[PDB]
Write a protein that binds this ligand. Structure first.
Ligand SMILES: NC(=O)c1ccc[n+]([C@@H]2O[C@H](COP(=O)([O-])OP(=O)(O)OC[C@H]3O[C@@H](n4cnc5c(N)ncnc54)[C@H](OP(=O)(O)O)[C@@H]3O)[C@@H](O)[C@H]2O)c1
Ligand SMILES: NC(=O)c1ccc[n+]([C@@H]2O[C@H](COP(=O)([O-])OP(=O)(O)OC[C@H]3O[C@@H](n4cnc5c(N)ncnc54)[C@H](OP(=O)(O)O)[C@@H]3O)[C@@H](O)[C@H]2O)c1
Ligand SMILES: C[C@@H]1O[C@H](OP(=O)(O)OP(=O)(O)OC[C@H]2O[C@@H](n3cnc4c(=O)[nH]c(N)nc43)[C@H](O)[C@@H]2O)[C@@H](O)[C@H](O)[C@@H]1O
Ligand SMILES: C[C@@H]1O[C@H](OP(=O)(O)OP(=O)(O)OC[C@H]2O[C@@H](n3cnc4c(=O)[nH]c(N)nc43)[C@H](O)[C@@H]2O)[C@@H](O)[C@H](O)[C@@H]1O
Lengths: 321, 315
């Protein structure tokens, strides 16, 4: 074999989700170099809360590389309900996946964190350094902390065994193959489904909260292309933030409007201010990711919202809803 | 009618709790059950589930954990993380599903933010990363609080914890390499008395610590199971004025044991965290009149115990 460009058997967990289908999409699209064997799995292949199944899965595949996306995910409102299930299930899934990869002897693992998890009381903009610098917002602390403990387990495997187990930190993500369930899903898909039912019913659109909170949104495909570059080129253990820039941060109100424009909605737009705004602001820096890939161009927000609404609309029956 | 399960019953703190209930602090209608790892490896779900099935615990005091001095922690943060996380999830979940009235796990003053104001209190537990020497351990104990807060918020379970400072007592782990400062310094002075060696105290001898005699802890712990109904944990420590330096601690031991040799410091060895001064103000709003056992007196009783049970003692 080649000492300098070596065979890869790559295991992607949570491969059927929003982020997972994007990587499939780009890889099937021709970003997969020769001598790379990609295996994407879902919970059908093995329930990663379970140790026996995970280990068995990890024996059957013999991955050199891991992208660990499998996690119980949800919007603000789902997290509020089940902080204990977000805590127990994700920590089991992460401990099983990291430890299986370890004893299988995998060369590298990139787990997946979130801007969600940073300290509520904070200086802005946030960055990789500040990950454990105070408690997270109380709305989603179960999930937050389970992610924080990935960073923790990463450094321990690395400090004790020299494992190149690291992670990425995406902001709020959106795109095709999302969870469009309104109750349990994120703001952008939830508004999309909402705008779809509204157009169809003659109803108003009800945007939850005040509309003033601020968010950074990354398109699943933009994120997938960085994810691919990370697995290959990036070799620190300290995680890296994958986010659109500071200047590209937006209110919930403009997000709603963007969906609206795109789906040609012409009915009333109403805000339910009784509902929770959650965390107001988690503004995050990409200066690090910039020092690596200074000339990468993110797909403009409004464009990505067009492509995502068109995807939902022409895949409405197949989508998760 | 209480059926109390004490995990880690065979450890330093556990023996202490066993000494006091037996000594008489058991109240009628309390069925005290102490266990150790031969009863069940709490890192295994199946075993943990089965213990909690046979025993039917109205209450749980959860001392069980992988524990060590600075120098063991430094080496083994991946174990310290993983093993403790497993035990605690297993115990807290079993407890929940047997439906216990109350669990009292055990945190530490170790696990507080390195970068902090002093004195440290219950409020600050998650206000920054812990020190790097024991991050694994530390984080695993914090997550107990996270998990505690999760069970109480979703199902209302009265799951809390206590935050003791450095403990010491009879039945401690006197393994010098793996154990805490005091029992290691005790083991050292004894091997020195037999050998005619100098005593080498590791570090500069300047770090500051708060020591609490297990026997004191025992009682406070016992009180907690009974009377303490906050989910937020409670610091159980000697007062802020009773903090001792390692040189003073070394001296204390040398007096008790009547050691006449030379006392020496290997300044190349880690000092760990210089200071973790903790406030017991909360505990005093409950127990204003609880007198702590003077530190020298307590040191003598451990040196006395150790010397007199050298062979049975964990060395
Ligand atoms: N979406 C965001 O806004 C966002 C932002 C930052 C970070 N992230 C992180 O990115 C990762 C991917 O998120 P996503 O948005 O793609 O979530 P998603 O679309 O809901 O997909 C979750 C994936 O995890 C799998 N999964 C869930 N529970 C499992 C279990 N018990 N065993 C095995 N597989 C299981 C799912 O498989 P099934 O199809 O079988 O259910 C699915 O493939 C997560 O780690 C998340 O924390 C997401
Ligand atoms: N000592 C201190 O300075 C200090 C300070 C603050 C807080 N604490 C906390 O106080 C608690 C008690 O500590 P300690 O000083 O008494 O420790 P210790 O003397 O080493 O005793 C540890 C206990 O845990 C049990 N144990 C360990 N691993 C186990 C496993 N896999 N399954 C079942 N049982 C297991 C041991 O049983 P075996 O006898 O079978 O090994 C033993 O009974 C711990 O939670 C510790 O974190 C200690
Ligand atoms: C990245 C994600 O961030 C999550 O916080 P967060 O950004 O508020 O997650 P979202 O649920 O995407 O955002 C909720 C914000 O958008 C408003 N909002 C308006 N309309 C809707 C709607 O139709 N659906 C939803 N869901 N919100 C809506 C809501 O009031 C709140 O300010 C974390 O809790 C998760 O852990 C997750 O990882
Ligand atoms: C309460 C305990 O606190 C621990 O920190 P910590 O107080 O430094 O734990 P110890 O190991 O008790 O203390 C180590 C301190 O005592 C000095 N020292 C001097 N002589 C000795 C000796 O003979 N043995 C040891 N071990 N130290 C010695 C050492 O340089 C350092 O300043 C945490 O890492 C644990 O998690 C644990 O829970």
């Amino acid at each position: 074999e080649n000492l300098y460009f070596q065979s890869m058997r790559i295991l992607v967990t949570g491969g059927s989700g929003l982020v997972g289908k994007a990587i499939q999409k780009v890889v099937a699209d021709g970003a997969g170099l020769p001598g790379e064997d990609w295996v994407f799995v879902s919970s059908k292949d093995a329930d990663l809360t379970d140790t026996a199944q995970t280990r068995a899965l990890f024996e059957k595949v013999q991955p050199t590389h891991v992208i660990h996306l499998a996690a119980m995910v949800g919007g603000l409102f789902r997290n509020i309900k089940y902080n204990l299930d977000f805590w127990r299930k994700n920590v089991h899934m992460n401990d099983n996946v990291l430890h299986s990869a370890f004893e299988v002897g995998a060369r590298k693992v990139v787990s997946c964190l979130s801007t969600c998890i940073f300290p509520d009381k904070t200086t802005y903009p946030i960055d990789e350094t500040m990950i454990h610098n105070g408690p997270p917002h109380n709305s989603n602390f179960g999930y937050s902390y389970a992610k924080r403990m990935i960073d923790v387990q990463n450094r321990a495997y690395f400090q004790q065994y020299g494992c190149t187990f690291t992670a990425v930190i995406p902001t709020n993500v959106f795109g095709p193959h999302d969870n469009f369930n309104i109750e349990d899903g994120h703001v952008l898909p939830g508004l999309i489904h909402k705008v779809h039912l509204a157009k169809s019913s003659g109803s108003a659109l009800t945007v939850w909260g005040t509309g003033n909170p601020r968010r950074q949104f990354i398109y699943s495909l933009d994120l997938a292309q960085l994810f691919i570059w990370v697995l290959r080129e990036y070799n620190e253990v300290e995680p890296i933030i994958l986010s659109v820039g500071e200047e590209d941060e937006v209110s919930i109100k403009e997000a709603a409007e963007a969906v609206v424009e795109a789906m040609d909605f012409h009915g009333e737009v109403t805000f339910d201010t009784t509902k929770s705004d959650g965390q107001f602001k988690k503004t995050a820096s990409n200066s690090k990711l910039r020092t690596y890939l200074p000339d990468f161009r993110f797909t403009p927000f409004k464009q990505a919202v067009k492509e995502t609404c068109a995807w939902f609309t022409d895949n409405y029956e197949q989508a998760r809803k």
